[PDB]
């Protein structure tokens, strides 16, 4: 049962490869033109196509850089490795796919650049504002000897950095970092405050680490008094904590959703009192650095990925690019499939697959294997195609303007292949009255200076 490679009526080696990854092509030259050309390599070999003429590329995945994951008890010896492998060379056929895998293992503490964006509006009692200050001092005192880095920004009507990352690293003293804070006692411009942090606090000159996890703890006691968008803070993991009587109604709590990351059930936290601020972050802190999540950069438009995750105790979750509830030294893995659509023009592209908050990454160098190697001697104007009327690449003719056929001979389109038996009017007769040649199931009459020959079967001579 002639399958996809044979059926599609292909006219060259390139679109034969473009039919399907399983298709191979024969370029024998010496072969009855109406023989099969695009088929599986086994079927091509089953007929007597010259075995060395067969073109059958195969997609492949080759590991280039495969530093092993670092173990627990790791000194910075050529730095630590948390993603393996780190570079892979992918070669893909037209519309083909190829799987690969990566192990991820959090070897190090986990670098987090955390910003406190705390409400300083007029609604806060002097004690409540102090509870917020002591909350931040508590968090920083509890995390002094970790890879956490802290910045704090008070916002009301205005936005003010009380200290940034370079200030925290330099002093490491929560009391001294916050001693100058004066309660603003004004409005609640949450939109502009989040934009301020995203562009004016998360900056490398001010101590921010470019590969660290960006976290935003927003503490507020009322709805925002400004408006706009926070597109500039899309790359920051944003928690928001609404505290007090102004978030009693579920309506008021829902206004906070657009400020926090998704889903709101994870990143929006509602409290009735400021006393519960100590215990609340204690639980938040457990989900900040306990999750590996794959992040795809520079993925070409013609490429699509699918992920199957093995997330501790061999729970094989199809669809997931993340695993949560991880500890130091745990190892997870992801099976990744990359399918291309057709064949892009730029034949070499790269992209990155990286865990959020990691410097380690997997770079995937892609090359698309679409052309046939028999473009070597493609013989334009070949004597196999009516002398000039066709280019002879890969053992067949690619017909120039006008002409058609196996050899570029049939000129005016026969269209419907039908049969050569439509060249003689009845079963046993010779074709074209013996005054012409059957070309693509249609008679083409012998030319003579003695007179024209016409008719469907070249029966009429005009002397
Ligand atoms: C800070 O914590 C790390 C974590 O083990 C420890 O190795 C280091 O000695 C601590 N520093 C001080 C000054 O205690
Ligand atoms: C994910 O698992 C499904 C079912 O086992 C399989 O069909 C698919 O190829 C897998 N994908 C990858 C990228 O391994
Ligand atoms: Ca308020």
UniProtKB/Swiss-Prot annotation:
Q: Which family does it belong to?
A: Belongs to the integrin beta chain family.
Q: How does it assemble?
A: Heterodimer of an alpha and a beta subunit. Beta-3 (ITGB3) associates with either alpha-IIb (ITGA2B) or alpha-V (ITGAV). Isoform Beta-3C interacts with FLNB. Interacts with COMP. Interacts with PDIA6 following platelet stimulation. Interacts with SYK; upon activation by ITGB3 promotes platelet adhesion. Interacts with MYO10. Interacts with DAB2. Interacts with FERMT2. Interacts with EMP2; regulates the levels of the heterodimer ITGA5:ITGB3 integrin expression on the plasma membrane. Integrin ITGAV:ITGB3 interacts with FBLN5 (via N-terminus). ITGAV:ITGB3 interacts with CCN3.
Q: Which residues are glycosylated?
A: 99, 308, 389
- The disulfide bonds in this chain are 5-23, 13-372, 16-38, 26-49, 311-323, 343-370, 374-394, 385-397, 399-408, 410-440, 423-438, 432-443, 445-458
* Name used for this protein in its record: Integrin beta-3
The effect of residue 426 to Q is: In alloantigen CA(+)/TU(+)
Q: In what residue span(s) does the I-EGF domain sit?
A: 374-409, 410-459
What species was this sequence derived from? Homo sapiens
Noted disease association is: Glanzmann thrombasthenia 2: A form of Glanzmann thrombasthenia, a disorder characterized by failure of platelet aggregation, absent or diminished clot retraction, and mucocutaneous bleeding of mild-to-moderate severity. Glanzmann thrombasthenia has been classified into clinical types I and II. In type I, platelets show absence of glycoprotein IIb-IIIa complexes at their surface and lack fibrinogen and clot retraction capability. Bleeding disorder, platelet-type, 24: An autosomal dominant disorder of platelet production characterized by congenital macrothrombocytopenia and platelet anisocytosis. Affected individuals may have no or only mildly increased bleeding tendency.
Q: What gene name does this entry carry?
A: ITGB3
Q: What is known of its domains?
A: The VWFA domain (or beta I domain) contains three cation-binding sites: the ligand-associated metal ion-binding site (LIMBS or SyMBS), the metal ion-dependent adhesion site (MIDAS), and the adjacent MIDAS site (ADMIDAS). This domain is also part of the ligand-binding site.
Section of the entire sequence shown: 27 to 548 of 788
Higher taxonomy: Eukaryota, Metazoa, Chordata, Craniata, Vertebrata
Summary of the function given for this chain in its UniProt record: Integrin alpha-V/beta-3 (ITGAV:ITGB3) is a receptor for cytotactin, fibronectin, laminin, matrix metalloproteinase-2, osteopontin, osteomodulin, prothrombin, thrombospondin, vitronectin and von Willebrand factor. Integrin alpha-IIb/beta-3 (ITGA2B:ITGB3) is a receptor for fibronectin, fibrinogen, plasminogen, prothrombin, thrombospondin and vitronectin. Integrins alpha-IIb/beta-3 and alpha-V/beta-3 recognize the sequence R-G-D in a wide array of ligands. Integrin alpha-IIb/beta-3 recognizes the sequence H-H-L-G-G-G-A-K-Q-A-G-D-V in fibrinogen gamma chain.
């Amino acid at each position: 049962g002639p399958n996809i490679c044979t059926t599609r009526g292909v006219s060259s080696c390139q679109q034969c490869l473009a039919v399907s990854p399983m298709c191979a092509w024969c370029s024998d030259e010496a072969l009855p033109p109406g023989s099969p050309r695009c088929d599986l390599k086994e079927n091509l070999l089953k007929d007597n196509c010259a075995p060395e003429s067969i073109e059958f590329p195969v997609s492949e995945a080759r590991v280039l850089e495969d530093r092993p994951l670092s173990d627990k008890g790791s000194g910075d010896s050529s730095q630590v490795t948390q993603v393996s492998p780190q570079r892979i060379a992918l070669r893909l056929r037209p519309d083909d796919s190829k799987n690969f895998s990566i192990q991820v293992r959090q070897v190090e503490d986990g670098n987090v650049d955390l910003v406190f964006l705390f409400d300083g509006s007029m609604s806060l009692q002097p004690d409540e504002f102090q509870k917020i200050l002591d909350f931040m001092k508590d968090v920083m005192k509890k995390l002094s000897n970790t890879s956490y880095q802290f910045a704090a920004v008070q916002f009301s009507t205005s936005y003010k950095t009380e200290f940034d990352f370079s200030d925290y690293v330099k002093w490491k003293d929560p009391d001294a970092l916050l001693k100058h804070v004066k309660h603003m006692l004004l409005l609640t411009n949450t939109f502009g405050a989040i934009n301020y942090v995203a562009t004016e606090v998360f900056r490398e000159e001010l101590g921010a680490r470019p590969d660290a996890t960006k976290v935003l703890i927003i503490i507020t006691d009322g709805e925002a008094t400004d408006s706009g968008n926070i597109d500039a803070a899309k790359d920051i993991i944003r928690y928001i904590i609404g505290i007090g009587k102004h978030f009693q109604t579920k309506e008021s709590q829902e206004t906070l959703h657009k400020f926090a990351s998704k889903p709101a059930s994870e990143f929006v936290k509602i409290l009735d009192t400021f006393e519960k601020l100590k215990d609340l972050f204690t639980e938040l802190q457990k989900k900040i650095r306990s999750k590996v999540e794959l992040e795809v950069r520079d993925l070409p438009e013609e490429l699509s990925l699918s992920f199957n995750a093995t997330c501790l105790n061999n729970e094989v979750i199809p669809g997931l690019k993340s695993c949560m509830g991880l500890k130091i030294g745990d190892t997870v893995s992801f099976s990744i499939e990359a399918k291309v659509r057709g064949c892009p023009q730029e034949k070499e592209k790269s992209f990155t697959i990286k865990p959020v908050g990691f410097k380690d990454s997997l770079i995937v160098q892609v090359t698309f294997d679409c052309d046939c190697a028999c473009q070597a001697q493609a013989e334009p104007n070949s004597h196999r195609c009516n002398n000039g009327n066709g280019t002879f690449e890969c053992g067949v003719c690619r017909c120039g303007p006008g002409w058609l056929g196996s050899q570029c001979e049939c000129s005016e389109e026969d269209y419907r292949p039908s049969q050569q038996d439509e060249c003689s009017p009845r079963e046993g007769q010779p074709v074209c009255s013996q005054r012409g040649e059957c070309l693509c199931g249609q008679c083409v009459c012998h030319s003579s200076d003695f007179g024209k020959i016409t008719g469907k079967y070249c029966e009429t001579r005009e002397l």
